[PDB]
Amino acid sequence: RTGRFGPRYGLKIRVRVADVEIKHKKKHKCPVCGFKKLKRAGTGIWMCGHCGYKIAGGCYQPETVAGKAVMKA
């Protein structure tokens, strides 16, 4: 997490960094298969180390509140 920043940048700044990055680094459930092996490949790029599926997702999350509203509509 934020620990790399030492005592720099202030609370809000780094707290949102850990938060964003903890969610960012969580185990994510693959869309193709059902396994929790999705890892961020780059900015908005996600892949499943299991089946190798490469998906277009949020920047720091595979699914964005809005991406989900799409499915329904």
Partner 1 sequence: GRRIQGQRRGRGTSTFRAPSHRYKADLEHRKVEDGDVIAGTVVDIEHDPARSAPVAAVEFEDGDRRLILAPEGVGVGDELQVGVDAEIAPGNTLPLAEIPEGVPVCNVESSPGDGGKFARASGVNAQLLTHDRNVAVVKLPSGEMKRLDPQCRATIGVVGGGGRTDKPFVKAGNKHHKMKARGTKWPNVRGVAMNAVDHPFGGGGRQHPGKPKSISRNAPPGRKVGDIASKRTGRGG
Partner RNA sequence: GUGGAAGUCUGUUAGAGUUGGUGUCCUACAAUACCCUCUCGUGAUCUAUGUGUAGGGGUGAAAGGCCCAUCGAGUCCGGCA
Partner RNA sequence: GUCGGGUGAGAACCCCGACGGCCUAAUGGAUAAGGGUUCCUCAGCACUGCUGAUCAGCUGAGGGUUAGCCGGUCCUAAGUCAUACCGCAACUCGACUAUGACGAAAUGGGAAACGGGUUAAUAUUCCCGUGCCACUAUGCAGUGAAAGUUGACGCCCUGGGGUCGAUCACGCUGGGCAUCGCCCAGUCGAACCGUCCAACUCCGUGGAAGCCGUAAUGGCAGGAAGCGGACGAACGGCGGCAUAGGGAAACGUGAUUCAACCUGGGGCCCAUGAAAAGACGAGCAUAGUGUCCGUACCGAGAACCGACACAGGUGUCCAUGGCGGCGAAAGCCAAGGCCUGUCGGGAGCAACCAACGUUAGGGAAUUCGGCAAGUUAGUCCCGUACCUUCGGAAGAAGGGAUGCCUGCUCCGGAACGGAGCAGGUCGCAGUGACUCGGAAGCUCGGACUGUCUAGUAACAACAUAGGUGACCGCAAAUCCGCAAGGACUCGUACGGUCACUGAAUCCUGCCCAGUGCAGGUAUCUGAACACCUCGUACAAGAGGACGAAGGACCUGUCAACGGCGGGGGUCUUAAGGUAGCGUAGUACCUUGCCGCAUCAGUAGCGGCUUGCAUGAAUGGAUUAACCAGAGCUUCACUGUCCCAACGUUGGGCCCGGUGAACUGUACAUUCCAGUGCGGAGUCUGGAGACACCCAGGGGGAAGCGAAGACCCUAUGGAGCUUUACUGCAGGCUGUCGCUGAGGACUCUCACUCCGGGAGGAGGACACCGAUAGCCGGGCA
Partner RNA sequence: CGAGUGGCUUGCUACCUCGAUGUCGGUUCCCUCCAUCCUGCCCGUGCAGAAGCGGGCAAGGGUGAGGUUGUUCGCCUAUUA
Partner RNA sequence: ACGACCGUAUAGUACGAGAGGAACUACGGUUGGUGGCCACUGGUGUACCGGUUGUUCGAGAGAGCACGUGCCGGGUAGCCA
Number of other residues whose CB lies within 10 A of the CB of residue 40: 19
Cβ-based nearer residue to partner 1, 27 or 68: 68
Question: Using CB under 8 A as the criterion, what x/- string covers residues 42-61 for binding partner 1?
Answer: xxxx------xxxxxxxxxx
The correct pick among 16, 25, 26, 36 for binding partner 1 (CB under 8 A) is: 16
Preceding residues of all breaks in the chain (C to N beyond 2.5 angstroms)? none
Q: Which of 69, 67, 66, 73 is nearest to 31 (CA)?
A: 67
Q: Residue type for 39, please?
A: K
List of residues contacting RNA (CB under 7 A): 3-15, 21, 25, 32-35, 37, 39-40, 42-43, 45, 49-51, 59-60, 64, 66
